């Protein structure tokens, strides 16, 4: 109301013009002139201004912007347009209206946190895009209506993900895709809808956010949020010669033994480097893990721990997972009735991890759709006249139980598990767990279990010999390693691997390229564990060792002894 006064309004407009034409960065460069030159070169229609600098320079503007967003933003758009006209008179020929974008709002709020008090106020929110509409013209302009759900990782268990509507105009149109995690800065306005009033029986306003700035939530934001103390602790950990041992021992403290399974799962978690050689073929940088186990080996416990640790994680069961559920599907909107895409579990697992429990229960028809996403990490949906492509870069961990409930060592791994050969081929790491009656191991298991039971009472609330790391420290290490390291394989001896692969061919025909690729990305991940920009051959040796162990574990008993004798050089 006070802003609507003409005098203060005009004075603030000219003050904002002086801010545009007067601000100086710490390096002595007028940033906005470079930004406007870049926009003119790119013929864009929007201008991005940092809220932090405006708050630092003009406190009154920073106070006014969240309170009177629409009028002040229109005034700033007019000021930017006239500044552009004064600086670039010809720019009226390419564009007729220029919009100001506000970025980095200090106040970030969740979709659950939306109340009445935030109505008609600028709010910053975070979420994941689920469905989007097309480009619609208006007799005023470009229109986009999208549906946003809360990020599954942030959502607590047992409570449904809530959904909201968002509107994008002109430049913001087509700036996002379904299944993409984004944060928004926009106005929380209310809309009048008589259908809701009739249905509920009282006045109801459907609140829809009109976003001003859209930013995809890449891990760059997470990198920025990292404290320098976290970085120094991670670097101090990296120089330790036994960093790998403590990292492996830090996973599943409550479970005793089973070094190979935790080794493989950590190695898959750290992930490799995806590559696109030539833009002609794409080599995946992801590890798919299969865990076949006799009952009583705490496979579900491992899956649950992985679910908790991961920043982004989705848990699914065998029986409740249909082909339509796992993937995105086409549906007619109940209100507007245009074809829309709803993302499945794998789509929301993009850049995250997906866990499959009781994978042996999968129907073959449901299995068929899995191979495409496993091999190409992308899904092509061709339904109801709509053909779309969606990213499916996810790390898949699957659990399985042998047919009959007991693993037979006298049979091949293919025979014991009711899965087709291509599915197993897509998996990079295979781990089989058996049950043996060893009195000393039984003593160790019983003692560790009873000790853990005593420790974790609510009233009361290693094999390598290394102290496990704190959970938060491990998570921070994982994030930093994922977002900083990019190893290079410039010191690999091709003759040794070629001879080993020839021997592998000999002893496999006696009983492929993707195995080589899996070993390569495994070495890359092991290098990423040590935070090394270049790969040392020790990573290659360890990857060879673990891959050979996994391969021999899948063979019959009559041949694994000969395999161990032949390959005693590498296993030692």
């Amino acid at each position: 109301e006070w802003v609507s006064m003409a005098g203060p309004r005009l004075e603030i407009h000219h003050r904002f013009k002086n801010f545009l034409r007067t601000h100086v960065d710490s390096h002595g460069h007028n940033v906005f002139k470079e930004r406007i030159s870049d926009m003119c070169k790119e013929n864009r229609e929007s201008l991005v201004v940092n809220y932090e600098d405006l708050a630092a320079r003009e406190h009154v503007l920073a106070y006014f912007l969240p309170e009177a967003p629409a009028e002040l933003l229109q005034i700033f758009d007019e000021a930017a347009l006239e500044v552009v006209l004064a600086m670039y008179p010809k720019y009226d020929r390419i564009t007729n209206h220029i919009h100001v974008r506000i970025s980095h709002l200090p106040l970030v709020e969740e979709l659950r946190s939306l109340r009445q008090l935030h109505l008609n106020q600028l709010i910053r929110t975070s979420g994941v895009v689920t469905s989007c509409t097309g480009v619609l013209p208006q007799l005023s302009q470009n229109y986009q209506r999208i549906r946003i759900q809360e990020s599954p990782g942030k959502v607590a268990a047992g409570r449904l993900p809530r959904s909201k509507d968002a509107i994008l105009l002109a430049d913001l149109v087509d700036s996002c895709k379904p299944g993409d995690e984004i944060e928004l800065t926009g106005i929380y306005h209310n809309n009048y809808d008589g259908s809701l009033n009739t249905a509920n029986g009282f006045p109801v306003f459907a609140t829809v956010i009109l976003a001003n700035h859209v930013a995809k939530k890449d891990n760059k934001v997470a990198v920025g949020e990292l404290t320098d103390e976290d970085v120094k602790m991670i670097t101090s950990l990296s120089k330790d010669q036994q960093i790998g041992e403590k990292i492996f021992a830090s996973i599943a403290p409550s479970i005793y033994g089973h070094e190979d399974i935790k080794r493989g799962l950590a190695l898959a978690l750290f992930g490799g480097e995806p590559k696109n050689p030539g833009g002609k073929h794409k080599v995946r940088g992801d590890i798919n893990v299969l865990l076949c186990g006799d009952p009583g080996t705490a496979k579900s416990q491992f899956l649950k721990y992985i679910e908790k640790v991961s920043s982004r994680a989705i848990f699914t069961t065998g029986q409740g997972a249909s082909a339509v559920g796992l993937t995105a599907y086409v549906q007619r909107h109940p209100v507007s009735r245009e074809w829309t895409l709803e993302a499945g579990a794998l789509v929301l697992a993009d850049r995250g991890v997906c866990l499959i429990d009781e994978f042996d229960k999968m129907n073959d028809q449901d299995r068929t759709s899995i191979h495409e996403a496993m091999e190409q990490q992308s899904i092509s949906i061709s339904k109801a006249g709509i053909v779309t492509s969606l990213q499916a870069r996810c790390t898949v961990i699957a659990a399985a139980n042998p047919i009959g409930g007991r693993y037979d060592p006298s049979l091949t791994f293919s025979e014991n598990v009711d899965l087709t050969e291509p599915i197993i081929s897509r998996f990079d790491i295979l781990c089989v767990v058996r049950d043996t009656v060893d009195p000393v191991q039984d003593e160790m298991l019983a003692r560790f279990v009873v000790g853990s039971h005593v420790r974790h009472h609510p009233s009361n609330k290693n094999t390598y010999g290394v102290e496990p790391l704190p959970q938060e420290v491990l998570k921070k290490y994982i994030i930093y390693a994922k977002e900083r390291v990019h190893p290079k394989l410039n010191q690999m001896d091709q003759d040794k691997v070629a001879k080993m692969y020839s021997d592998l061919r000999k002893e496999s025909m006696a009983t492929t390229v993707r195995h080589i690729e899996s070993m390569i990305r495994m070495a890359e991940a092991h290098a990423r564990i040590h935070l090394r920009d270049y790969v040392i051959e020790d990573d290659v040796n360890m990857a060879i060792r673990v891959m050979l162990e996994s391969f021999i574990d899948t063979q019959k008993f009559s041949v694994m002894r000969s395999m161990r004798k032949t390959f005693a050089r590498y296993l030692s």
């Binding site: 696109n276 050689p277 030539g278 833009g279 002609k280 073929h281």
Partner: protein
């Protein structure tokens, strides 16, 4: 209008056939005959009507059989990308004058089909009975090709080196090897050639093809009679029509109004190498 002169210059060279063959999937090692067959399928023949109302097919049909790993799906994808109209299925109305690729074989459309062996891998000693399709549906295909995993110690090394070089050098540079035509340029050239004109055979070529057809029919006779077994790939007048169509496509590639004896000879050689080896 300027592109018409470019297409005329490209088609007036004495080596258009070799350039087109090299332009068909330069990444894939070998298969020069398969590349030429794919090229002439893409160019295609010409349809002719008759006053009695009857129409004769102006499109070519090819079938491929071989062990897995012979790069069959890659050729189908390349054909679908290169063709102005292209459909790819996993096993027709929306395609008019285009090419339809059909994997797992076990309306004016050219058909390119891929299939696998009955037992999974080819058995040379068993000979016949490795194809489950009936002769009735096999007769429609103009040509049939058989690919086998020719295991050579040096050939595997060469293939691995070629694949690794393709993997490595692809980000570095994307350039034609020796005068290869761009995908868009080749697409426009094929469209222009198809739209512009369609050739017809000659009397001498017709007589030569008739004599060769009679000789080949007698040979297929004698092979069947001596073998005391019915061949799964019979030879009928449809094979003669297919050879005529291939010769017409070869003449169309040169935009000549009348086909020459060289086109008929090349068509006969390709038909021999495909069908007679397959049969």
């Amino acid at each position: 209008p300027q592109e018409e002169e470019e297409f005329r210059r490209l088609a007036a060279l004495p080596n258009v056939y070799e350039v087109i063959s090299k332009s068909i999937a330069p990444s894939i090692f070998g298969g020069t005959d398969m590349k030429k067959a794919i090229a002439c399928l893409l160019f295609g023949g010409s349809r002719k009507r008759l006053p009695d109302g009857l129409t004769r097919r102006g499109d070519i049909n090819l079938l491929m059989l071989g062990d897995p790993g012979t790069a069959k799906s890659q050729l189908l994808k390349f054909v679908e990308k290169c063709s102005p109209i292209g459909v790819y299925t996993s096993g027709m109305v929306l395609a008019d004058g285009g090419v339809v690729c059909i994997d797992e074989f076990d309306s004016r459309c050219s058909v390119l089909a891929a299939a696998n062996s009955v037992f999974g891998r080819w058995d040379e000693t068993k000979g016949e009975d490795n194809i489950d399709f009936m002769p009735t549906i096999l007769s429609r295909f103009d040509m049939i090709f058989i690919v086998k995993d020719e295991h050579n110690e040096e050939r595997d090394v060469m293939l691995a080196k070629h694949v690794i070089t393709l993997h490595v050098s692809a980000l570095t540079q994307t350039q034609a090897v020796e005068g290869e035509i761009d995908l868009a340029k080749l697409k426009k050239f094929i469209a222009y050639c198809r739209v512009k004109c369609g050739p017809r055979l000659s009397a001498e070529a017709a007589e030569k093809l008739k004599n060769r057809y009679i000789i080949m029919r007698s040979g297929a006779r004698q092979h069947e009679r001596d073998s005391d077994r019915r061949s799964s790939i019979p030879i009928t007048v449809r094979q003669l029509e297919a050879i005529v169509r291939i010769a017409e496509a070869l003449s169309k590639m040169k935009l000549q109004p009348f086909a020459t004896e060289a086109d008929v000879e090349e068509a006969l050689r390709l038909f021999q190498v495909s069908t007679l080896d397959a049969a």
